[PDB]
Amino acid sequence: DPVHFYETSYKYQAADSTYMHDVAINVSIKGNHFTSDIIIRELVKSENKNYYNVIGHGDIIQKNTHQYYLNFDNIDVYTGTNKANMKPYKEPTSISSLINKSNNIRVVYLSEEYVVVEFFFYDGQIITLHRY
Amino acid sequence: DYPSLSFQQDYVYIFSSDFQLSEELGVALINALSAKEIVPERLYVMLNDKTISFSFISKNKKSKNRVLSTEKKLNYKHISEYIVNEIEY
Numbered sequence: 001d002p003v004h005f006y007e008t009s010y011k012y013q014a015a016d017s018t019y020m021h022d023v024a025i026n027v028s029i030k031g032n033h034f035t036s037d038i039i040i041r042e043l044v045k046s047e048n049k050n051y052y053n054v055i056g057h058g059d060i061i062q063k064n065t066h067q068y069y070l071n072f073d074n075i076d077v078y079t080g081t082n083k084a085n086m087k088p089y090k091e092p093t094s095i096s097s098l099i100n101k102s103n104n105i106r107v108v109y110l111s112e113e114y115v116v117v118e119f120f121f122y123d124g125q126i127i128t129l130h131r132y
Numbered sequence: 133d134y135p136s137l138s139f140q141q142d143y144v145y146i147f148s149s150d151f152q153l154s155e156e157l158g159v160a161l162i163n164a165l166s167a168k169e170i171v172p173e174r175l176y177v178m179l180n181d182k183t184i185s186f187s188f189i190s191k192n193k194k195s196k197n198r199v200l201s202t203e204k205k206l207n208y209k210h211i212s213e214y215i216v217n218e219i220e221y
């Protein structure tokens with residue numbers, strides 16, 4: 001069974017505030033299992049910088065050629081103000097609710113160099129990931 | 133759980149339950165980008181109630197991805213100008 005890697009980054013802005021996320025996503029898929037690493041830098045005017053490292057793994061389930069589901073076995077959340085020293089952090093609701101639940105990923109385009117998906121962040125987001 | 137493809141022209145793919153908004157935004161995007169001599173390989177846009185996201189795939193297969201949350205709906209002109217500015221810079 002070969003391993004396939006998917007990597008992307010995105011920036012989140014809010015039209016009604018200064019909240020911003022800079023997010024890198026790294027996903028590896030082997031068979032029906034996946035490992036995900038999500039690195040977040042969180043900014044806002046009323047508070048100083050903040051980093052989050054979200055490590056998870058679980059089952060990826062193929063329903064159609066374009067309909068997949070990610071069901072996490074576990075997710076760990078680390079936080080810190082400097083990427084050098086991060087420390088464990090109790091899972092927020094938006095993380096713990098993803099465990100033992102099938103989260104929707106819909107593929108809209110597939111090439112050998114990238115894939116375009118609608119997925120469940122922010123209750124609906126479209127993004128392109130580079131294929132490795 | 134996601135809007136269906138409601139507008140597809142040239143390199144633009146817009147996923148939204150609102151056809152009028154989809155076509156208005158899609159044409160505004162093609163007009164503004166062509167005027168600046170920007171021709172993406174593909175441009176994907178998703179319009180939700182409270183969230184807008186897009187993926188810009190450049191000629192070199194590199195991607196730029198953005199999410200914009202808004203408490204009140206924006207008209208196609210503002211959404212187009214936001215997307216184009218993020219792509220431009």
Ligand SMILES: C[C@H](CCC(=O)NCCS(=O)(=O)O)[C@H]1CC[C@H]2[C@@H]3CC[C@@H]4C[C@H](O)CC[C@]4(C)[C@H]3C[C@H](O)[C@]12C
Binds near residue numbers: 021040054120122123
């Ligand atoms: C808990 C964190 C800080 C929240 C905060 O700043 N609280 C103070 C303001 S308040 O006064 O208390 O409201 C936030 C900041 C960024 C978030 C991720 C963004 C990507 C992704 C989006 C998906 O939709 C759900 C999963 C997802 C991985 C998210 C997990 C978690 O939610 C994160 C880490």
Ligand SMILES: C[C@H](CCC(=O)NCCS(=O)(=O)O)[C@H]1CC[C@H]2[C@@H]3CC[C@@H]4C[C@H](O)CC[C@]4(C)[C@H]3C[C@H](O)[C@]12C
Binds near residue numbers: 151
């Ligand atoms: C975008 C709409 C779907 C909205 C919706 O409700 N999505 C499911 C949500 S839910 O599951 O119900 O919750 C769809 C529904 C009807 C479509 C027109 C049909 C005639 C004509 C056919 C031509 O080929 C292209 C132009 C044309 C005017 C079309 C434009 C657009 O495609 C329209 C408006």
